[PDB]
Amino acid sequence: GFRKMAFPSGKVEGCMVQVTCGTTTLNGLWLDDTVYCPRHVICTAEDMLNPNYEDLLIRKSNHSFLVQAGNVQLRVIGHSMQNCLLRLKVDTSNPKTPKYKFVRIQPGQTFSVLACYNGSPSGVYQCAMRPNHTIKGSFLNGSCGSVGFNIDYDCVSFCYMHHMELPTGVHAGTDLEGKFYGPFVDRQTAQAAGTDTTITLNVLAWLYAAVINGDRWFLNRFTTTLNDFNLVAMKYNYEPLTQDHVDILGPLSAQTGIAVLDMCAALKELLQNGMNGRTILGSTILEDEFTPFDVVRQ
Amino acid sequence: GFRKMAFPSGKVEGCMVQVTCGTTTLNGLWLDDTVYCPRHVICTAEDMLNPNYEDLLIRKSNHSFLVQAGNVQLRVIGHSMQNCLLRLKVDTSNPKTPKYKFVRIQPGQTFSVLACYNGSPSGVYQCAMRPNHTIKGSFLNGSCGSVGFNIDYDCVSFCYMHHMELPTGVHAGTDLEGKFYGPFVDRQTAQAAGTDTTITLNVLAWLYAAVINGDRWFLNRFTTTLNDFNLVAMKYNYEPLTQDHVDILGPLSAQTGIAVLDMCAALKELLQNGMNGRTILGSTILEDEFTPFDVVRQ
Ligand SMILES: *C(=O)[C@H](C[C@@H]1CCNC1=O)NC(=O)[C@H](CC1CCCCC1)NC(=O)c1cc2ccccc2[nH]1
Numbered sequence: 001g002f003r004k005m006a007f008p009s010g011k012v013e014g015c016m017v018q019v020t021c022g023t024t025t026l027n028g029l030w031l032d033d034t035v036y037c038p039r040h041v042i043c044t045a046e047d048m049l050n051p052n053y054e055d056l057l058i059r060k061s062n063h064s065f066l067v068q069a070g071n072v073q074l075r076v077i078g079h080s081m082q083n084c085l086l087r088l089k090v091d092t093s094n095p096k097t098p099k100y101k102f103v104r105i106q107p108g109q110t111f112s113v114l115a116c117y118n119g120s121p122s123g124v125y126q127c128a129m130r131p132n133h134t135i136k137g138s139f140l141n142g143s144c145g146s147v148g149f150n151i152d153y154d155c156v157s158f159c160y161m162h163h164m165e166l167p168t169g170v171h172a173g174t175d176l177e178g179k180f181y182g183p184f185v186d187r188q189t190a191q192a193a194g195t196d197t198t199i200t201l202n203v204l205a206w207l208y209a210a211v212i213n214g215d216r217w218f219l220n221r222f223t224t225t226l227n228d229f230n231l232v233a234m235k236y237n238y239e240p241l242t243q244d245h246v247d248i249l250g251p252l253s254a255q256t257g258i259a260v261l262d263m264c265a266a267l268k269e270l271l272q273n274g275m276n277g278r279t280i281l282g283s284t285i286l287e288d289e290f291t292p293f294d295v296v297r298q
Numbered sequence: 299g300f301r302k303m304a305f306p307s308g309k310v311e312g313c314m315v316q317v318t319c320g321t322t323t324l325n326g327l328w329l330d331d332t333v334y335c336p337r338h339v340i341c342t343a344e345d346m347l348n349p350n351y352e353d354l355l356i357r358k359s360n361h362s363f364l365v366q367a368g369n370v371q372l373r374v375i376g377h378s379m380q381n382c383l384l385r386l387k388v389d390t391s392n393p394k395t396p397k398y399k400f401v402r403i404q405p406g407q408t409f410s411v412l413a414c415y416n417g418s419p420s421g422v423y424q425c426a427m428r429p430n431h432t433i434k435g436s437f438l439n440g441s442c443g444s445v446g447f448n449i450d451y452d453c454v455s456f457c458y459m460h461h462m463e464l465p466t467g468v469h470a471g472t473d474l475e476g477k478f479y480g481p482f483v484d485r486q487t488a489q490a491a492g493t494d495t496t497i498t499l500n501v502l503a504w505l506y507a508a509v510i511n512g513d514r515w516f517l518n519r520f521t522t523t524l525n526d527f528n529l530v531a532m533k534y535n536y537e538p539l540t541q542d543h544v545d546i547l548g549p550l551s552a553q554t555g556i557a558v559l560d561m562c563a564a565l566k567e568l569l570q571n572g573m574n575g576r577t578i579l580g581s582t583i584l585e586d587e588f589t590p591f592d593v594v595r596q
């Protein structure tokens with residue numbers, strides 16, 4: 001019993017609306033009296049190739065934004081641009097607005113995605129900010145505006161809004177202040193991400209998750225130094241391990257009875273010799289989208 | 299970009315309550331003026347070994363049942379037993395009751411679980427009813443009463459309520475009629491699931507999914523027949539394929555140009571050679587909890 005778990009999405013579902021400009025429809029996030037959505041909703045198919053969003057936005061009126069909260073249409077009474085987001089002010093304040101915050105997540109961190117289509121939520125899943133600032137989502141046509149988020153107590157931390165799919169099929173988007181994660185831009189032009197790496201801190205947390213659930217076959221008696229581990233990390237495209245990373249793994253190290261560098265020796269062996277057809281926590285690949293916090297939560 | 303997604307949990311979240319009998323706490327489902335919960339909440343540590351539930355129930359006052367919807371205490375007006383659930387009538391009908399149906403899911407179908415503890419939802423994940431009528435869930439102490447469900451438009455089809463974990467780590471529970479899935483009983487005795495078979499329909503879907511999202515390396519220029527396949531499938535403890543199942547695969551076959559029976563001949567291939575390292579779509583063991591109705595719906 002260990003698997004990717006998403007946060008319950010009820011507090012986010014109530015915030016999802018539909019936003020339409022001409023023949024373009026996508027999802028918006030409705031908090032108090034503001035609707036956030038990707039600004040490229042104002043793009044026609046031709047403007048997408050190289051838009052000037054300031055020009056495009058100045059030529060629109062509040063009336064050109066159709067905002068639907070289910071059956072109720074909301075009237076846009078104002079609007080502005082923040083980076084790659086639109087902020088549409090509406091006459092109604094969302095009564096389902098939860099306690100929330102806008103946060104910018106760091107690479108390797110996880111969040112829940114509420115995938116949405118025409119303003120109605122359709123699925124919820126967990127994923128991670130990749131070290132190269134993409135996310136490996138499952139976004140289809142019409143999912144722009146879907147948000148990523150974490151829940152702490154009763155507060156929703158919004159961290160991602162979806163904008164686009166790169167040619168490799170991974171995804172790119174912004175935080176809720178509209179700044180893109182990574183080097184990308186909202187222009188329909190082929191864009192590459194940097195070469196990705198494996199989130200070592202997450203792999204190790206998942207190795208602890210396995211031990212906690214009785215999967216010990218990969219352990220061994222050996223240990224290793226930080227510097228000696230990093231040398232193998234570099235060879236196999238893993239993020240180097242920091243002393244703060246080791247400090248993060250403290251609680252897991254203590255509950256299991258396995259020193260962090262002992263788990264690193266075990267991981268070094270898995271990288272060098274593979275896994276010999278065996279599985280860890282049901283997986284045959286070293287999973288790197290579970291954070292240490294994720295592990296202790298479950 | 300191929301992953302398990304759960305349905306958005308909001309409509310179920312607003313139905314979760316906490317139910318306490320003396321020193322045993324678990325979750326309940328609050329629809330209108332009924333709360334549903336497993337009947338084993340009325341066991342004490344000494345009763346779990348061989349409970350006489352009609353005996354234990356008659357000895358319970360309505361006041362013995364501490365039901366709480368968040369901050370509010372709900373007052374139990376009456377109670378009856380339906381199979382292995384209690385139906386607690388309460389004074390107030392829950393205003394967040396959605397449109398809902400009670401359904402009995404079949405082996406191989408999937409549903410989302412809302413893992414709950416103390417009446418408060420903690421996480422949502424996807425899983426499948428195994429052919430041996432267990433589920434491979436992630437349930438901790440206090441999870442009983444959590445529900446599994448699917449959502450059709452705006453209607454919540456509840457299909458599972460959690461009761462117990464078997465010695466092998468898998469999980470057993472009931473439909474919302476209180477009829478257990480499988481031959482399990484709510485007594486803390488030595489029960490075991492029968493040998494679990496592989497959901498062939500879903501392995502075939504995953505093989506198609508490989509072809510759809512790029513991964514095409516395993517097919518062959520050969521083709522089998524339905525009985526010849528089902529015969530091999532049984533020797534390896536794979537479910538035989540049904541008449542209905544070949545039809546369910548229709549859309550995947552057409553979109554891929556690989557006849558169902560050709561993929562069946564591939565499966566008897568990938569069956570007897572091993573993936574020699576090369577992963578399918580993210581894993582190099584065969585995934586059987588991904589439906590055709592997931593491969594297409596993604
Ligand atoms: C918004 O709903 C979609 C989400 C895409 C759709 C498919 N999978 C996704 O993640 N967003 C888009 O289609 C954009 C279009 C651009 C508008 C102008 C500014 C930049 C984004 N994103 C794309 O990534 C896209 C569409 C597209 C069509 C044909 C060839 C390549 C291509 N890339």
Ligand SMILES: *C(=O)[C@H](C[C@@H]1CCNC1=O)NC(=O)[C@H](CC1CCCCC1)NC(=O)c1cc2ccccc2[nH]1
Nearest residue numbers: 338346437438439440441442461462463465484485486
């Ligand atoms: C309710 O919350 C729990 C859910 C369990 C807890 C751990 N993981 C789960 O899914 N339900 C139980 O604990 C049951 C108690 C009822 C069983 C039916 C009749 C009496 C009450 N107990 C078990 O599920 C259980 C105990 C046990 C002991 C040794 C091996 C396996 C085993 N399973």
